[PDB]
Design an enzyme around this catalytic site. Structure first.
Site, short mmCIF file in Angstrom:
data_model
loop_
_atom_site.label_atom_id
_atom_site.label_comp_id
_atom_site.label_asym_id
_atom_site.label_seq_id
_atom_site.Cartn_x
_atom_site.Cartn_y
_atom_site.Cartn_z
N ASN A 127 46.51 -30.72 21.25
CA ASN A 127 48.11 -29.60 21.21
C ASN A 127 47.91 -28.99 19.37
O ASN A 127 48.37 -28.06 19.10
CB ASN A 127 48.73 -30.19 21.51
CG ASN A 127 48.91 -30.73 22.77
OD1 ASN A 127 48.99 -30.40 23.64
ND2 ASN A 127 50.05 -31.69 22.98
N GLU A 159 45.62 -5.70 24.33
CA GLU A 159 44.44 -5.01 23.87
C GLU A 159 43.88 -6.39 24.04
O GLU A 159 42.16 -5.90 23.97
CB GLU A 159 44.42 -5.39 21.78
CG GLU A 159 44.86 -4.14 21.30
CD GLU A 159 44.13 -2.77 21.30
OE1 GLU A 159 44.03 -1.36 20.58
OE2 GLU A 159 43.08 -3.24 22.28
#
Ligand SMILES: Nc1nc2c(ncn2[C@@H]2O[C@H](COP(=O)(O)OP(=O)(O)OP(=O)(O)O)[C@@H](O)[C@H]2O)c(=O)[nH]1
Ligand SMILES: Nc1nc2c(ncn2[C@@H]2O[C@H](COP(=O)(O)OP(=O)(O)OP(=O)(O)O)[C@@H](O)[C@H]2O)c(=O)[nH]1
Ligand SMILES: Nc1nc2c(ncn2[C@@H]2O[C@H](COP(=O)(O)OP(=O)(O)O)[C@@H](O)[C@H]2O)c(=O)[nH]1
Ligand SMILES: Nc1nc2c(ncn2[C@@H]2O[C@H](COP(=O)(O)OP(=O)(O)O)[C@@H](O)[C@H]2O)c(=O)[nH]1
Ligand SMILES: [Mg+2]
Ligand SMILES: [Mg+2]
Lengths: 42, 49, 426, 429, 427, 429
Positions: D220, D246
């Site tokens: 993580n 984008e």
């Protein structure tokens, strides 16, 4: 008695839904399952 | 000798959240060197309409 | 806040409970009186599961102790940890069953179910989300075999969503204690095949073998046998009482261990079981924990899985460091031994992890296994039952209390069915 | 102005969220209480008007034993208490429990907190979903979330970040059911979905870092560095800024295929990164090696169809353009014929922030690619070969059908992916 | 980290390991309790090729000590270095083969082999990679020889590619301690030649001389003699444990020495041996070490090199030593007596050098040689066994135990083949 | 137009043929029924039952009954599959002088029928063993006849030569020497292929430990597909069947070419590689890929048909063929300056659905003839001397119709073959 398939038996029961245990015994009993005509040639 | 001799072992009853995620140092916090200064206010939609 | 109500029935169950409630009384850190003289704070965080709460720091265990005769319950009350149980949750009659399932399930037994059902209602409603009930018995007696199953039936009729887990001590292969044990068992499975969501087969013979071959122990007592059942009764409800990385409750274990409906018999087994003189010579690493929790000698039941084929496997691992060696050495097993794992199910192991280590050990693990080798258990029970019903032995006792002979044949049916139902999925 | 709300669902999403918000609390100067000891935090943190920055997130799970840890530990006073949503019983590795019977009693609490966050926010750009396919509430409640997240927000961006279940190893057994049923439901309700693996981040930590035997937190930490680099240019000044919008405009050609991969380049430990130069050409070559992608699929089988390159710290456009030109020449890496350019480079000036207790060194140059390939089609076929053969005699469906679904849902979930197993080679040809 | 598993068989093997596992423990630095109190880091790095890691520091050894009687398996468990062997790596029965190859291999010794393979598989798969097995026993009994040859045929079957060192204690010519000795010896050699890659012959009589004529004690004993046997075994696998200037293994050893897959009977030895009266009187140097290396008096078997001819010869050296003087002098001893060296092999000697000698030694070495002087050893056993098999003596202690008569006459046929195999390179 | 008739005699030939008729089928494109969803190997009835061009022969039933009941039974028109009562024992005397006569009339009549339906036979293709009975006698009868009957038409013969130490029958040694004296003056070309060497090719290369008979046959299949691919499909430098003989057989009695496939790769090792046309070539002249055990070094090379297949440019071949000439190892004979015929088809080596072969896009099937078959000849000759020294197993061959002199005639004959595959190689002065 020709025994039971037990593969399509559990498959065919869960089609309608037999999740709980005690209801599955009722569906255990009621779902008891064990050249051309003319052609050419040449 | 650190894995031969065990730690003082007050950490027998502690979850993985406590050991892996301690309080970070106040000096290890990162400074935002490449960012825009707020004392010039950012371009906000000045029309509140 | 999920809670598990305990239901110990029969002498055997009141001796498996004596140890479980003492084992779960250490895990959480509750002394006999009922207070908390422990250390960590993750010990009183989830006491709600197997412990209620009263005046001050009293934590009266949520357990309804049951026995037809009032002798075994009396022993408990006047034992080491007996002033912890609420005196009212001790439901006992006066006469017994005399090793007769008939009496327990039809006569002296349906005359007590009412009072036992009252307390299991005052200890279930007295709680919010109930993970489910839980029973500890000995298929092969009368209270544990009959009343046990009478309760297991009338609790699924009122609470039909809670998880009915049962830890049954199935009759041993050779070791014979009660002579009318074939019957009691054969007549007490038809109920445990349709009124439980997760039953465990803990034969006493297997237990002696892990206290002889693995845990070299000259003189095994029933306490050692009971310890090996309690240890594997605290690992299945471990991610509900202590923080974890990959948590796993008592349902998130059935969901991924009971393939099709009927099949629901599981073979338990512990992991960090080493001797006393051989305790400081073995490094307790994850490798040296799976090797034993899959080896057949450890299986806490008497049906070596080699003779069968695991339809599913679990592993409620308890300990800290365990997130890459765990999986790498859990796929390994499914890869080497590849004929002892069905193919109609791709992955066959349910991994879990509780970052709180069992006091003393650095890491432990509990393997709930659904091998089709459990089809042997029933097979022997039937070979024996059929041998006595033929020359109608003892029937007089059973037929008298109130039971047609059809019931007996109906039972051999349900059982023989399960064996064939299993055989097909194999 | 440039806010985004990260919705963490599942215990996978909680442990992802604990590491993501730990990094964000060091990137922006927010000590674990919440008060700073300069306006780059609006994207992730709010303001109370007294220094109390509250993270723009909700932590939701059906099981309390994991969400009560952050309610007790170090980052206790950081999170708003009503932003931590918990239930009373887990879905227990079921899509149907998470979607139908137990996910219905918390979704109105969740969408109440989402509406409170959304009304607080002005220029809301995109939700972020963190979960795992192999879980019950990570696949069932996550699927039910987007069915009612879409109607309330319409064409708003929804970036998925899901833990794809592992190809060769696993941790669950009923997880093929949890993997088929949610990608039917979340296919029309997700603009981009980032595929990551356990065993492919796991292989990165073992050979490319020195740290053997890693935990969920070591995975993580890498997860946090990705999503930090994903939302890097949105907060800090950069030469070539990329938006959340984008990404989908430059990576997904068709709405049916929205599965980009992820790869973080300079994952090198403290001793080993002190011993090697880390030029832009050296780190962009690490992103295309097969053993650095975080899904165990070989791109040699597939074909690259869009790539979005990210850059952090001291990178110059001259070194980047020579690096992009070099990787085009090599024949081991194949682009599809209808994609002649296939690149989106984004440069942020801020270097990645080190975490005390991490597994990475102080680095000045980093890459986070999002490259969808044709090579994901082998991941579907393998996961369907272990599904349809397993579904051949209705293996575990009794825990799904009569407790809130039907048998016909299974018949249309695999058949939907059969169309998806037909969609990807139409790209390839 | 290449792994060696050591096996003991019988009263001879247990006493060898009782006197070997003290040498490695006093050399690596392991105390009687297992805790590593070493003096340097260059003993702990390869602690893996031997004693296995267990929490607390305990470096528990890796040796399956086996015996068919509950007699010597106790002597070890209750002695200086006894609390080190895992209290389960000890497989001890109760009957006892009773100096008979039959019931040690077929009836009573075949019930305990399942208990050993359950132990051998347990601790040989926990290692990263297994380099090979090794075993020490005597051919003279029924436990070290009977169950030792059954165990060696099993562990070869599942693991074929592994290398195998076996240190047989062959019979003495002059004084024998068993009347049925050439029965347990010949039928053990048959099980030894197709199931081993290299075999060293140890003699009880030949090592009695060294402690009297070289070490000069009036009362040499088994304890004073098993230290010599353990010296060469700790002297063979040194390059696996320690670095050096020219490093080898059990396979650079094996390839250079045995040319043909049957001629793997070698000449063990230990160079730096002298009496306690020549303690501070002797320069422990290479001309004082290589000269005594090749002498027939410093040989751990009843063989004379002077009557036979060497095939290949070999040594590993220890300690901080230049070796131009073991490249000139090993070439001189190769060249000074070419009558004792084979002609068709151009270079007969191999060389390997370690960097650590044993504690108490400054520069040591061990000896190994393939020779046709094992010929007189095997034909002496052959002439002794055929002289008793013609009159059908002691067969009913070998026939009534489930063994047919046919493997008796196959046992002599195989050894008569092997003596002929050393006949063709006699001159 | 171009046509070829195939006769499969003996379990060997028949079994190898079941493989060939499955391969040739998928290639052209006719379902086992012989109907599509003239071909130089198949014919065509009106309706569309593309029928085959083969006459399966075997005194013993079973073998061919499995072909008259298997999936490929709706093809070979009954008349073709000619079995027999039984008595198919390992006896050249029983297959050429006894239980063969009562079938040579039928087999020959069918060969005639297919020759009449044909329109320009380029030769025949007899598949046989070389160490049994029906394949060491019934085949000598077929050749003895075709010679007169179909006069001169390149009768090419594929064979399974006896092994160097892995055989079956104890009579094998005899049969072979007695099937040479006959099928040495009638067969225009006999491509010998062993069984021991093919096992190794499926051990060292195909890495498929446990080779059965199905696998060893599929290998002969793709080899015979090449030899007969320059007649059905197109291709640049194409060969035929009348030139194989003019481009491989040096002097008259030296017509025994070997065989070697090139890209024998398994379905698990084509991760991205494609051995080029310079590798497959330098791989066929390797002293190990030879499908017949005969170190091509203890003997010079006299010819070599490096037939290629699939995508192959007519220049990479030239460079390779030359490279090979350089290698000192490869010692071609003096009287053969050129000694390097070539060929290139375009059909990419086909794939048997369920085979151990991948989709390689290039393959060379070298049909060379080296003065190294002498060792195999010498071997079977000594393996015959001992047996005859004490008239072993002669009681049988003499009773089914033969003399105690045919043996010495065949011996003087095979002795000559040895001296021929010898004088042919002593250089020149
Ligand atoms: N990459 C990665 N995956 C994780 C991590 N933690 C959990 N997971 C994933 O979580 C999956 C298991 O499902 P869970 O998250 O435990 O369960 P859930 O999604 O909360 O659903 P429930 O079963 O109802 O609790 C595994 O397959 C893991 O891949 C993590 O830290 N990193
Ligand atoms: N590669 C391969 N060789 C085969 C196969 N079947 C048979 N053979 C070879 O054929 C030999 C025996 O079969 P044949 O000689 O053809 O038998 P036959 O010609 O019918 O003569 P009889 O046995 O007398 O009936 C064996 O030694 C094999 O080498 C096969 O399926 N594959
Ligand atoms: N494992 C285990 N089994 C026990 C223990 N105590 C009794 N049993 C078993 O329980 C059985 C007796 O049950 P029983 O007393 O007849 O049940 P009840 O009469 O209905 O109360 C015996 O066969 C014992 O084997 C124990 O402490 N541990
Ligand atoms: N070198 C040496 N040899 C020994 C020792 N103990 C016994 N032996 C040899 O072993 C032989 C007897 O072997 P035996 O005890 O019958 O072996 P067992 O069958 O395994 O018990 C004798 O001839 C001795 O030469 C020892 O401590 N050192
Ligand atoms: Mg969970
Ligand atoms: Mg035949």
């Amino acid at each position: 008695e020709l025994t039971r398939n037990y593969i399509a038996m559990n498959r065919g029961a869960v089609k309608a839904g037999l999740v709980t245990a005690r209801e599955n015994l009722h569906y255990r009993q009621l779902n008891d399952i064990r050249l051309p005509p003319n052609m050419t040639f040449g | 000798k650190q894995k031969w001799l065990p730690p003082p072992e007050a950490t027998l009853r502690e979850s993985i959240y406590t050991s892996s995620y301690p309080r970070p140092p106040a000096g290890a916090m990162s400074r935002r060197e490449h960012a825009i200064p707020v004392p010039p206010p950012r371009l906000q939609p000045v029309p509140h309409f | 806040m999920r809670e598990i109500v305990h239901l110990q029935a029969g002498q055997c169950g009141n001796q498996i409970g004596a140890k479980f409630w003492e084992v779960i009384s250490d895990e959480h850190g509750i002394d006999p009186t009922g207070t908390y003289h422990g250390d960590s704070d993750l010990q009183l965080e989830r006491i709600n599961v197997y412990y209620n709460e009263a005046t001050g720091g009293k934590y009266v265990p949520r357990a309804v102790l049951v026995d037809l005769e009032p002798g075994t319950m009396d022993s408990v009350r006047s034992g080491p940890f007996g002033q912890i149980f609420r005196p009212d949750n001790f439901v006992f009659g006066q006469s017994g069953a005399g090793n007769n399932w008939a009496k327990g399930h039809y006569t002296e037994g349906a005359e007590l179910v009412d009072s036992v059902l009252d307390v299991v209602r005052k200890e279930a409603e007295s709680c919010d989300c109930l993970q489910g009930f839980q029973l500890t018995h000995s298929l092969g007696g009368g209270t544990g075999s009959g009343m046990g199953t009478l309760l297991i039936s009338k609790i699924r009729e009122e609470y039909p969503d809670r998880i009915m887990n049962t830890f049954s001590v199935v009759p041993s292969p050779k070791v014979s204690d009660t002579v009318v044990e074939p019957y009691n068992a054969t007549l007490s499975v038809h109920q445990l095949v349709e009124n439980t969501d997760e039953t465990y087969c803990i034969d006493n013979e297997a237990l002696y073998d892990i206290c002889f071959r693995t845990l070299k122990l000259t003189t095994p007592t029933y306490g050692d046998l009971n310890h090996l059942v309690s240890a594997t009764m605290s690992g299945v409800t471990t991610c509900l009482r202590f923080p974890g990385q990959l948590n796993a409750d008592l349902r998130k274990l059935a969901v991924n261990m009971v393939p099709f409906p009927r099949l629901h018999f599981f073979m338990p087994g512990f992991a960090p079981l080493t001797s006393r003189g051989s305790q400081q010579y073995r490094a307790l690493t994850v490798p040296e924990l799976t090797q034993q929790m899959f080896d057949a000698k450890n299986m806490m039941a008497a049906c070596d899985p080699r003779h069968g084929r695991y339809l599913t496997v679990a592993a409620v691992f308890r300990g800290r460091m365990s997130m890459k060696e765990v999986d790498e050495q859990m796929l390994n097993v499914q890869n080497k031994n590849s004929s002892y794992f069905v193919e109609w199910i791709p992955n066959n192991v349910k991994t879990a992890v509780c970052d709180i280590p069992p006091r003393g050990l650095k890491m432990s693990a509990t393997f709930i296994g659904n091998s089709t080798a459990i089809q042997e258990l029933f097979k022997r029970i039937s070979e024996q039952f059929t041998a006595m019903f033929r020359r109608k032995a003892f029937l007089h006792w059973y037929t008298g209390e109130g039971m047609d002979e059809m019931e007996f044949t109906e039972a051999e049916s349900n059982m023989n069915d399960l064996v064939s139902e299993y055989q097909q999925y194999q | 102005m440039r806010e985004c709300i990260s919705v963490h669902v599942g215990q996978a999403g909680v442990q992802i969220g604990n590491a993501c918000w730990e990094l964000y609390c060091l990137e922006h100067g927010i000590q674990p209480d919440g008060q700073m000891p300069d306006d780059s935090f609006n994207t992730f943190f709010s303001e109370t008007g007294a220094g109390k920055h509250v993270p723009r997130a909700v932590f939701v799970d059906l099981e309390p034993t994991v969400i009560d840890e952050v309610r007790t530990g170090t980052y206790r006073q950081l999170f708003h208490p009503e932003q931590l949503i918990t239930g009373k019983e887990d879905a227990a590795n079921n899509y149907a429990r998470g979607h139908y019977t137990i996910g219905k009693e918390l979704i109105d609490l969740v969408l109440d907190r989402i509406r409170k966050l959304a009304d607080q926010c002005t220029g809301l750009q995109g939700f972020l979903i963190f979960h795992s396919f192999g879980g019950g509430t990570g696949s069932g409640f996550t699927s039910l979330l987007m069915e009612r997240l879409s109607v309330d927000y319409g064409k708003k961006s929804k970036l998925e970040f899901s833990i794809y279940p592992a190809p060769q190893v696993s941790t669950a057994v009923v997880e093929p059911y949890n993997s088929i049923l949610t990608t039917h439901t979340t296919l029309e309700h997700s603009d981009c979905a980032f595929m990551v693996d356990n065993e492919a981040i796991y292989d990165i930590c073992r050979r490319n870092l020195d740290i053997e035997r890693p935990t969920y937190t070591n995975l993580n930490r890498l997860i946090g560095q990705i999503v930090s680099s994903i939302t890097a240019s949105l907060r800090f000044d950069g030469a070539l800024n990329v938006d959340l919008t984008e990404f989908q405009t430059n990576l997904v050609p068709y709405p049916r295929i929205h599965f980009p991969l992820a790869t973080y380049a300079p994952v090198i430990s403290a001793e080993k990164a002190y011993h090697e130069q880390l030029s832009v050409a050296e780190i962009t070559n690490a992103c295309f090696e097969p053993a650095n992608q975080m899904v165990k699929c070989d791109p040699r089988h597939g074909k690259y169809m869009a790539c979005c390159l990210l850059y952090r710290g001291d990178v110059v456009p001259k070194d980047v353009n020579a690096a992009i030109a070099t990787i085009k020449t090599k024949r081991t890496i194949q682009f599809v014929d209808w994609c002649p350019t296939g690149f989106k480079v984004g440069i942020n000036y801020q270097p990645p922030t080190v975490v005390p207790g991490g597994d990475l060194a102080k680095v000045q140059r980093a890459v986070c690619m999002l490259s969808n390939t044709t090579a994901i089609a082998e991941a579907w076929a393998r996961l369907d070969h272990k599904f349809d053969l397993m579904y051949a005699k209705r293996a575990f469906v009794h825990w799904y059908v009569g407790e809130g679904m039907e048998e016909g849902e299974f018949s249309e979930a695999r058949e939907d992916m059969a169309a998806l197993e037909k969609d990807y080679e139409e790209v390839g040809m």
